[PDB]
From a paper:
Stimulator of interferon genes ([name]) is a transmembrane protein located in the endoplasmic reticulum (ER). The activated cGAS converts GTP and ATP into 2ʹ, 3ʹ-cyclic guanosine monophosphate–adenosine monophosphate (cGAMP), which binds to [name], leading to its conformational changes and trafficking from the endoplasmic reticulum (ER) to the Golgi to perinuclear endosomes. Consequently, [name] recruits tank-binding kinase 1 (TBK1), which phosphorylates IFN regulatory factor 3 (IRF3), leading to its translocation into the nucleus to drive the transcriptional induction of type I interferons and the nuclear factor-κB (NF-κB)-dependent expression of proinflammatory cytokines. Based on our molecular modeling analysis, along with the reported CDN-[name] crystal structures, we designed a novel series of fused tricyclic heterocycle compounds and analyzed their binding to human [name] with thermal shift assays and the potency in activation of [name] signaling with a reporter cellular assay.
After exploring combinations of different monomers and various linkers, we identified compound [name] with significantly improved binding to [name] and cellular reporter assay (thermal shift ∆Tm = 10.7 °C; EC50 = 0.03 µM). We then obtained the crystal structure of [name] complexed with human [name] protein in C2 symmetry with 2 molecules per asymmetric unit that validated our predicted binding mode in the cGAMP binding pocket of [name]. The structure revealed Fo-Fc difference density for a single [name] that spanned between the two monomers resulting in a loss of higher C2221 symmetry. Further rational optimization based on the information from the cocrystal structures and structural activity relationship (SAR) led to the identification of [name], which has greatly increased human [name] agonistic activity compared to the CDN compounds. It exhibits selective and potent activity across all known major isoforms of the human [name] protein.
Numbering used by the authors:
A (entry chain A), B (entry chain B): 153 to 228, 239 to 343
The structure:
């Protein structure tokens, strides 16, 4: 009995498979403007946050102030937000960013006692969700190329973890890949 | 590996658990009007269609013409549709009616070859979805009393199946239950 299998399949079949095709077009279009205006550029892949603690806030900035809402992405109806990632108040990157909503479900199950679903269970299913979704996107056509999964475990407490730094690590790796190959 | 577990849990935690509480109230309010106008009454329970063939149309009437849209249910934002069930052109019942969307996912998985998910698999998982959702609602607090699951397998082919008759059987059984106990 693994809820993560179905959660992952539903998240792909009912959301990602449908939104990802439009995305590279929406982003190229926006980048025309963003470039001519702020000489910037938004990455072309959807960045999906997978906090293994299943903590999904209502606004990204609350999880890190160095992640700042920049703009809504226009459509070619799905709502997507571009964020700028800051370092010392200086813009270091930009990307379309959002949390994997199914993890909220996991969280809620852990707070729903009739479910008999512990925090241990919840973490286990979060990792399985990440794995299953990786596997799905691996066999998927151009969907894998259109997004990147950012899975992370935050420290038990009082340790220097920056979500913005994790995302920037991924963005910089993506650019390195793009220019070297 | 059973996607129905997660599909069922997500459909409960993320949709039903949230909408059902408002529903008894929304329906009572509407019934004030409906009564004073057409001397009719809408059942208080959400009726959830679970076709085991995972065929979900975009409008109920296409699956049966004796199921006729009547009105949108107002809010106390979620969109819910009241339907009248007809017999020989005469109204025989009314209720808030909608398909279980997760079945669409199953259908799509069966048409997505990378999934290795057959029609046999689709039917098995549809039955498991029905069972798991029944189990969940059974342990759930007054949520089970707010909705009713209408699961059905349509004929091999060319036999007498009427969706409106199935729904009316359930509605008539529900009224019998309310008046006798
Ligand atoms: C969670 C409940 N659930 N579990 C399963 C299984 C099926 C359902 C289900 O039926 N949900 C649902 N019923 C609604 C009814 C009404 C109404 N009658 O008024 C109104 C709704 O909108 C609130 C309803 N919603 C929300 C569906 C959101 C669904 C599409 O839109 C989205 C838009 C954007 C966006 N940036 O623009 C992001 C984004 N992220 C997700 N998440 C999933 O896609 C996902 C997760 C899992 C697991 N599977 N999926 C596929 C269903 N989405 C969306
Ligand atoms: Ca956290
Ligand atoms: Ca059918």
């Amino acid at each position: 009995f693994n809820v993560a299998h179905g959660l992952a399949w539903s998240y792909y079949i009912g959301y990602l498979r449908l939104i990802l095709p439009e995305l590279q077009a929406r982003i190229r279009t926006y980048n025309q403007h963003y470039n001519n205006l702020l000489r910037g550029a938004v990455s072309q892949r959807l960045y999906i946050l997978l906090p293994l603690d299943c903590g999904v806030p209502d606004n990204l900035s609350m999880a890190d102030p160095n992640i700042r809402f920049l703009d809504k992405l226009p459509q070619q109806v799905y709502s997507n937000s571009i964020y700028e990632l800051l370092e010392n108040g200086q813009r270091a990157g930009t990307c379309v960013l959002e949390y994997a909503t199914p993890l909220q479900t996991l969280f809620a199950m852990s707070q729903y006692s009739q479910a008999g679903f512990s925090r241990e269970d919840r973490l286990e299913q979060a990792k399985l969700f990440c794995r299953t979704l990786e596997d799905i996107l691996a066999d998927a056509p151009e969907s894998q190329n259109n997004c990147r999964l950012i899975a992370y475990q935050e420290p038990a407490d009082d340790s220097s973890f920056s979500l913005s730094q994790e995302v920037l690590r991924h963005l910089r790796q993506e650019e390195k890949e793009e220019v070297t190959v």
